[PDB]
Amino acid sequence: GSSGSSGTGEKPYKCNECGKAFRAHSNLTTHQVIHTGEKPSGPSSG
Ligand SMILES: [Zn+2]
Structure with a gap:
């Protein structure tokens, strides 16, 4: 073994x-591009 x-x-x-x-x-970070959220800056705004 x-x-x-x-x-x-x-x-x-x-x-x-x-x-x-x-x-x-x-x-x-350079790869996180494709994984970009929807308007991260600021509150949820929902
Ligand atoms: Zn990835």
Whole structure:
């Protein structure tokens, strides 16, 4: 049998909208584009 695995946090960014995983932050934000909400700035206005 085998044993031994180190858990590192190299990919702290993980898009929880489509199912992806990046390394840097700039990459995530640039990908968040497609996942743009509807008028985020301000209240719900509903
Ligand atoms: Zn995504």
